[PDB]
Write a protein that binds this ligand. Structure first.
Ligand SMILES: [Mg+2]
Ligand SMILES: [Mg+2]
Ligand SMILES: [Mg+2]
Ligand SMILES: [Mg+2]
Ligand SMILES: [Mg+2]
Ligand SMILES: [Mg+2]
Ligand SMILES: [Mg+2]
Ligand SMILES: [Mg+2]
Ligand SMILES: [Mg+2]
Ligand SMILES: [Mg+2]
Ligand SMILES: [Mg+2]
Ligand SMILES: [Mg+2]
Ligand SMILES: [Mg+2]
Ligand SMILES: [Mg+2]
Ligand SMILES: [Mg+2]
Ligand SMILES: [Mg+2]
Ligand SMILES: [Mg+2]
Ligand SMILES: [Mg+2]
Ligand SMILES: [Mg+2]
Ligand SMILES: [Mg+2]
Ligand SMILES: [Mg+2]
Ligand SMILES: [Mg+2]
Ligand SMILES: [Mg+2]
Ligand SMILES: [Mg+2]
Ligand SMILES: [Mg+2]
Lengths: 156, 93, 226
RNA sequence: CGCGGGGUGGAGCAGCCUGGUAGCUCGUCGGGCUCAUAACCCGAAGAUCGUCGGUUCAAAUCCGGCCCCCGCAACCA
RNA sequence: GCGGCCCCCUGGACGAAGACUGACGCUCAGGUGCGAAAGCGUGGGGAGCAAACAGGAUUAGAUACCCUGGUAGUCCACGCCGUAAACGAUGUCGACUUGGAGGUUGUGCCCUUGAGGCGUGGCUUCCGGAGCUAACGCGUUAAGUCGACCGCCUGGGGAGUAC
RNA sequence: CGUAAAGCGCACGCAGGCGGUUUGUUAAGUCAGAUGUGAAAUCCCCGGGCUCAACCUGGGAACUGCAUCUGAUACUGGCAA
C-alpha cells in the first residue's frame, strides 16, 4: 500500500590514487497517501543497489502528518539550509501545483490540493527535507485546542 | 513522618569529615593482588594500591573487613573516584 | 520493592561530582553544594525512584525483557549478578556501538558464538593440530566475554536499565532511536534529556548501585511472579 | 486441440493490478513454561512465486511459450 | 596609537553610600574634527639605519636576493596631505537567553585563625550548550531572539578607470 | 552585508527618523457610519440575442480614491500636570 517515487539519481566521484571511482546516489520518498511520508537517501556503487538502499531507509524514518481532507490545515513555511518552501491549502479540484521535488513528496503523502512555491536553492535533497519539515511543523484544530486548553468550536 | 532530608543531611555532615587531609577509618571491602577496596563514606570506595599495604618484608598485613586508616586526599578527581592515600597517613604515625 | 531515604543516604546516593563538571540540566535535582561537591536532592530521588519501579513492575508483568547496562569497573560485577538473580539480560563489558540499531549484525555474531561453543562442547573435537583447536577456543572465550549477557536475548529488549547515563550515553541514544524506554541512574554531570525515567543519584559507589540493583531485581521478580 | 481461471516454504491462505518492501494460519526441531505429557511462549527451519524465456537501472507482479491443475464444452449402445 | 624616571597643565573610565534634576534620550544625510607610514613646503638637526646611487660578488643573464659604502628620509618646529590587510575583514544604542576555566581593577561579609572562605560591580582571554550558519564557525563581549537609526550590495573583467 | 558583492578609518553633531511611565484634555493620524462623487465602454457575476462561439446586450458588483458630516478614544500625535 506504500507508494514510492524516485526523485533524483546522481553520479558522484571519489578520485582515488589510481583515478576516479564513480558511485551513484538515489533520492526516494515513500508514503501511504493518508498522512505518513518518509524520505531516504541511499548511496551505492550501482543504481539498482542505490535505489534499493534508499527505499529501505525511506520505509523507516517515516513521519505522520495531520492532513485535512487531502489538503493542508494552514499555510506553512519550511526552510532546511538554503531552500525556503511555502505551501498553502487550496480548494478541491485545484490539483497539486508545486516544483518537482515538492511534487513527489506531496503526492506520496496524500495532499491532493496544494499551492506551493520554492524559494532559494532548489537542490532536490534540501527541498525534500524542507518540505517534510514544514509538513511536520503544521498543527491541527484539535491539537491546537488541546494545547490551548479549549474546545474546537471555541477556537473555530 | 517528614524527617527532612535537610535535617538528615546536617546530621551526616556532622558525622564524617570532608576536609582534604583528614585520616578516615575505612573498611577493607576486597583485597586484589594489586588493589584493595576501602570504603569511607564518600562518593565511591577507593581502590588503594596493594603496594601501600606491603611492609618492609613485602607481606599484605590486612584481611577483608578490617578498618584501615586512610588519609583523605581528594573526594573527587574529576572522575567520581575518591582518592584515598593511606601511605600518606603513616606520616601522622 | 521499597527503599528508604535513610538507606539511600547511608548508601551515599546524595553525593555528586564537582561543581565545575556538572550539567546545568541537573539543576532541579541539586540540593546545593558543599566543599565544591554537588549534593543531589533525595526528595526528588524517592518519588522518581518509586515511579520508575512501577513502570518496571508493569513491564515485567507483561513478560518484558529488561537489559541491565553498566560497564564501569565499579558496577560491572554487580549488574551481572543482579540481572541473573531475576532471569534477565545484562551488558557488563564495553557496549558495542550498534548492539541495538545493528542487531542484524549482532545476531550473526550470536550464531557464530552458538556454533563455536557447540563444536568445543558438543563437537568436543579439538583434534585440530592442538594449535588451531586452542586458538579456536580463544575465539570462543572472546565472544563469550563480549556477548554472554545477551547471547539468549533473541530480540530487541523492551526496556533498558542503565548505570551512569553519561558514561553509557551511546546505549541511551540507540534506545531513543528505537523507541525503547530508558531507566537511568543520572549523576550530576550527566544529561537527562535522553532518559525517559530519570533516577537522580550517585552512580559510582558500589553500595549505591547495589541498592538500586537489588530493588530493581526484586521488583522484576515480583512482576514476573505476579 | 475450445474458453476461462488458478499454480506462491511440507499444507492452507495475503502478497499480484500501481515495478523496488515476500506477510498471515497449521505442521516440524529445540528451549522457557508445566510435576510431566499435552496445550501455550521464545526462537529456528523450510518457496524462488510451475518452468522457459522477453522487458526494464531493477520482476512473484509487466510480455510470450511449454508444463500441469481446476472449471466449463454441443456428440455414445 | 601610547613604554626610562620626575615635575606642571589636562581628558576619560570604574566602584561604595547617599542626595539632587525629572525623559533632559538613541541614531544621524550634509557639516566639522581627529586620523599609522610614506610624501610635500619653509627652517633646523643629523649618532645609528637607509630608498636612490657607487662598487664587489653570485648568475646563462642579475637593472635583485648577499657584501662594502651611502644621499633623501627617519628626529625637531610650523603648515599641507588624508590614504592602509586604518582588520575583530563584524556600524552605533538598548533589552532578553543554560554553563566552565582564567586575567585585571574595585567593593561587602565571615574565624584574618596564616596569603582563607563567601558575595557583589567594571573591563578582558579561552572553551563550549541551545540556537544560528552554505560550511567553516559564532556562541551573554553573538554571527542567538528582537526593537530604533544610519552606511553599503546587485555576475567577472573593463574599473575604483575615463569625463 | 565575519570569509561569497557589500559596515564609512574614527568621533562630534544640525536637519530628519524614533521615544520610559501616569493622569486629564484634544481629536490630527486611526477606526465606524452616513452623504456626494468616482463618465460610458472595458475587467467580474447572473442573464438575454445572433444555429454555436468570437461578437452584441439588460441588470448588478466593482471603480481598492477623494471631499464633507456624525460618532469611538485603545493606540500614535498635540497640549497641560
Ligand atoms: Mg538562486
Ligand atoms: Mg558624513
Ligand atoms: Mg612621516
Ligand atoms: Mg621634510
Ligand atoms: Mg630641510
Ligand atoms: Mg645595502
Ligand atoms: Mg579605504
Ligand atoms: Mg592597525
Ligand atoms: Mg587583524
Ligand atoms: Mg573595510
Ligand atoms: Mg567558542
Ligand atoms: Mg581616481
Ligand atoms: Mg589606490
Ligand atoms: Mg577575497
Ligand atoms: Mg568580501
Ligand atoms: Mg569599523
Ligand atoms: Mg555619535
Ligand atoms: Mg511615549
Ligand atoms: Mg517626535
Ligand atoms: Mg479624526
Ligand atoms: Mg465606469
Ligand atoms: Mg445563446
Ligand atoms: Mg454588459
Ligand atoms: Mg490620546
Ligand atoms: Mg496622549
Amino acid at each position: 500500500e506504500l507508494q514510492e517515487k524516485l526523485i533524483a539519481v546522481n553520479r558522484v566521484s571519489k578520485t582515488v590514487k589510481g583515478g576516479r571511482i564513480f558511485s551513484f546516489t538515489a533520492l526516494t520518498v515513500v508514503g501511504d497517501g493518508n498522512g505518513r511520508v518518509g524520505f531516504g537517501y541511499g548511496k551505492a556503487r550501482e543504481v539498482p543497489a542505490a535505489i534499493q538502499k534508499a527505499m529501505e531507509k525511506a520505509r523507516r524514518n517515516m513521519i505522520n502528518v495531520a492532513l485535512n481532507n487531502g489538503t493542508l490545515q494552514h499555510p506553512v513555511k519550511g526552510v532546511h539550509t538554503g531552500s525556503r518552501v511555502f505551501m498553502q491549502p487550496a480548494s478541491e479540484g485545484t490539483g497539486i501545483i508545486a516544483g518537482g521535488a515538492m511534487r513527489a513528496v506531496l503526492e506520496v503523502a496524500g495532499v491532493h490540493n496544494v499551492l506551493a512555491k520554492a524559494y532559494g536553492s532548489t537542490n532536490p535533497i534540501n527541498v525534500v527535507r524542507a518540505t517534510i519539515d514544514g509538513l511536520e511543523n503544521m498543527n491541527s484544530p484539535e491539537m491546537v485546542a488541546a494545547k490551548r486548553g479549549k474546545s474546537v468550536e471555541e477556537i473555530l | 513522618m517528614t524527617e527532612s532530608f535537610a535535617q538528615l543531611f546536617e546530621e551526616s555532615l556532622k558525622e564524617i569529615e570532608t576536609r582534604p587531609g583528614s585520616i578516615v577509618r575505612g573498611v577493607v571491602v576486597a583485597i586484589d593482588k594489586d588493589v584493595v577496596l576501602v570504603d569511607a563514606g564518600l562518593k565511591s570506595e577507593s581502590a588503594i594500591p596493594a603496594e601501600q599495604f606491603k611492609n618492609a618484608q613485602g607481606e599484605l598485613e590486612i584481611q577483608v573487613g578490617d578498618e584501615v586508616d586512610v588519609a583523605l586526599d581528594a573526594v573527587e578527581d574529576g572522575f567520581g573516584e575518591t582518592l584515598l592515600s593511606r601511605e600518606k597517613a603513616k606520616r601522622h604515625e | 520493592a521499597t527503599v528508604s531515604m535513610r538507606d539511600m543516604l547511608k548508601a551515599g546516593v546524595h553525593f555528586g561530582h564537582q561543581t565545575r563538571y556538572w550539567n546545568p540540566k541537573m539543576k532541579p535535582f541539586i540540593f546545593g553544594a558543599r566543599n565544591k561537591v554537588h549534593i543531589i536532592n533525595l526528595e526528588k530521588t524517592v518519588p522518581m525512584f518509586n515511579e520508575a519501579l512501577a513502570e518496571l513492575n508493569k513491564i515485567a508483568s507483561r513478560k518484558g525483557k529488561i537489559l541491565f547496562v553498566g560497564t564501569k569497573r565499579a558496577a560491572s560485577e554487580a549488574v551481572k549478578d543482579a540481572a541473573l538473580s531475576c532471569d534477565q539480560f545484562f551488558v557488563n563489558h564495553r557496549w558495542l556501538g550498534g548492539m541495538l540499531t545493528n542487531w542484524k549484525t549482532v545476531r550473526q555474531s550470536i550464531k557464530r558464538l552458538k556454533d563455536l561453543e557447540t563444536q568445543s562442547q558438543d563437537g568436543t573435537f579439538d583434534k585440530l593440530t592442538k594449535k588451531e583447536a586452542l586458538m579456536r577456543t580463544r575465539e570462543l572465550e572472546k565472544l563469550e566475554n563480549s556477548l554472554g549477557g545477551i547471547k539468549d536475548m533473541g530480540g530487541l529488549p523492551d526496556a533498558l536499565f542503565v548505570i551512569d547515563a553519561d558514561h553509557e550515553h551511546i546505549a541511551i541514544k540507540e534506545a531513543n532511536n528505537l523507541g525503547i524506554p530508558v531507566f537511568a541512574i543520572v549523576d550530576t554531570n550527566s544529561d537527562p534529556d535522553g532518559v525517559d525515567f530519570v533516577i537522580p543519584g550517585n552512580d559510582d559507589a558500589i553500595r549505591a548501585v547495589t541498592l538500586y540493583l537489588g530493588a530493581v531485581a526484586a521488583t522484576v521478580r515480583e512482576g514476573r511472579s505476579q
